[PDB]
């Protein structure tokens, strides 16, 4: 009646009576709630609702907030759809020295408004359909309707009218520089180039005035790369092919490591003979990895400048990208030159640690910490301590994964609840608007999956579906479901076209959606790979490999700008902390200092963190910039994270800094994260830095034909690491010709 059994656990189906623990703080109490009752979607959109999208404000606001279907920005209003393009004169880079922040952003203006001839008083805008990256927004006023189809990577906006015709309204009269009757090429007063397309015979009127009109029930708008009539002619070819379906289909080739993704649209013809295809605008993370077979479709000189650099290309029905999955590990192995008794001391010191809150995030950080300690305890021969840590993980998870208490009533805290209205699993206690805004389910639940994966590595029985594995699989479905999931939308967190996760469930900001900790996203994907490998779930594993590998490609472009092509030259920092649809910030969601505005995109450190070391020149450049700003190696906070990061390129330096300060303070103290960040430990730090000192640099030039591995290179000497989750021994072949044998449930080397 009020909960559903899943193996030995359960989730609530009615909102629980929350146990506030006597806490009266209104912020805390307000967090223990639900997402909005009203969803602005039509009756054509049923089942679990998509969240965490670039377009989500359309579903949550009566109209919308400002959105970034690059190359455009748009927003829905009662009067119609405002369209804007950030030109170079709209873009700024600002620094607040006192705050230690930087901001790259544009403007919230209007180049023109797409209007309906019958009304400028629409009652609302709803989601009428969506696919993997386009949305169809429907402005409604009784008989009057205007359906707008648009998307990230679409230089078209398609507009379909019921009970009226087209109007384009400008504050200052545009320059119509090409008048083909039914097709016009035009520029705003400030020289931004667009085009509009109607069916043949439906001619544009009002040329030279502030208002352009057309009798058609269909128009398209395009952003033109240049004031160029040859480009206009090309845009005409696909202006009548309205995108209805759009899918990002992927494969993982386990033998080579190649993750192949094909982006395919299906269109509906608005004039006789319109082709089945479109003009895509590709982002850097896409076109830098374009498959050979798609190269012939590139429209070479078709460039658009946006927050994320230069978009380009590309015509037709589909295109394909190719990426390389680099492996992950369950932990670093025992290969460091540490004082083993010193490490054992740190492992025991860690029993003093405790969670600094009762919510899913703080509890998550704590269980992540225990899961990281357990394999290190095993390696040092502290086997009962390792079992103690895994026992504590079991006690915590077996609590959280049951929604009912001993009497069969719903609990008031430490439980999961299925919100049916949206279709999402919410955990209470909640924080960071995980429940009220559907935020951060990857960030939080990734830690629960880490804990489960460490249990499963030692105890396959616990992890069975009929035991505790069903509830873990339910949490994973919430944040990364496959298609046709009866409870959850497809790949909730991930935007397959933008290439990254979006953290905010609702997206009701004028900068679109955002993501701060890309490393906490990569942590979630890693842990699902590990969990799925441990539990024999190939389909789930491969989906997490696709996510890990794609997200990595976006991180290296938009957070790190490893290729030094995207961030403006005048932007001082060597990282963007928070990526939005519409802007980039060197800033945090909480009040922080200098280190945190870098390290929130490094933490936590774990067996999937080696992606951070693929670009040693970047690692050096970012570290040196942070050091310059600090003015020394007296890190303001989270010193251990900076040492661990530094170890990717200079472990001698990291070791020197660590030796100097790691023992400055003693046991766990929540009031002091100067030296050890609260999700980290001395044991983890010491183990990490000494391992990288012995191993050398991450070597992404070598792949393997199994997924759980890493390759390091120290002055030309390679070390090959594999962990085998199987009951049977395996042979792993590496792309440089090397091969190794691995026994069941072990590393090939450094089991300790
Ligand atoms: O060391 C002591 C110090 O530690 C800090 O903990 C760090 C922790 O905060 C950090 O968490 C990451 C987190 O940022 C991220 O979650 C965010 C989520 O926080 C964000 O919420 C925003 C609200 O912040 C915002 O607040 C509004 C406010 O800005 C405005 O001025 O006033 C309004 C008054 O009501 C207020 O509402 O509101 C918007 C909605 O409008 C919310 O969305 O939302 C984003 C998504 O949009 C979400 O991603 O993700 C993770 C947690 O889920 C974390 O990565 O993590 C660090 C490392 O673990 C911690 O060190 C404490 O916060 C400090 O208090 C301590 O002193
Ligand atoms: O200095 C001591 C105190 O500092 C603290 O932390 C600071 C921290 O709160 C701050 O967070 C930044 C966010 O405020 C910022 O949020 C922006 C939104 O406010 C804005 O909302 C608009 C809304 O105002 C308008 O009415 O409606 C719009 C929709 O129509 C809506 O968009 O949206 C922006 C995006 O569109 C959004 O950016 O977001 C920043 C990241 O981009 C955050 O960094 O950041 C400071 C720097 O890190 C922190 O110092 C503590 O919270 C206090 O307790 C301390 O006392």
From Swiss-Prot:
It is an enzyme of class 3 (hydrolase). Residues 2-225 are annotated as: beta-sandwich subdomain. Residues 226-324 are annotated as: alpha/beta subdomain. Disulfide bonds: none annotated. Coiled coil: none annotated. Residues 334-696 are annotated as: (alpha/beta)6 barrel subdomain. (1,3-beta-D-glucosyl)n binds at residues 361, 365, 432, 440, 444, 504, 514, 516, 520, 673, 678. It comes from Halalkalibacterium halodurans (strain ATCC BAA-125 / DSM 18197 / FERM 7344 / JCM 9153 / C-125). Residues 2-696 form the GH81 domain. The keyword Secreted applies. Cleaves internal linkages in 1,3-beta-glucan. May contribute to plant biomass degradation. Keywords: Carbohydrate metabolism, Cell wall biogenesis/degradation, Glycosidase, Hydrolase, Polysaccharide degradation, Secreted, Signal. One of its GO terms (cellular component) is extracellular region. The CBM6 domain binds the non-reducing ends of beta-glucan; this domain may therefore target the enzyme to polysaccharide termini in damaged regions of the plant cell wall susceptible to catalytic attack. Belongs to the glycosyl hydrolase 81 family. GO terms for biological process: cell wall organization; polysaccharide catabolic process. It catalyses: Hydrolysis of (1->3)-beta-D-glucosidic linkages in (1->3)-beta-D-glucans. Its EC number is 3.2.1.39. This is Glucan endo-1,3-beta-D-glucosidase. GO terms for molecular function: carbohydrate binding; endo-1,3(4)-beta-glucanase activity; glucan endo-1,3-beta-D-glucosidase activity.
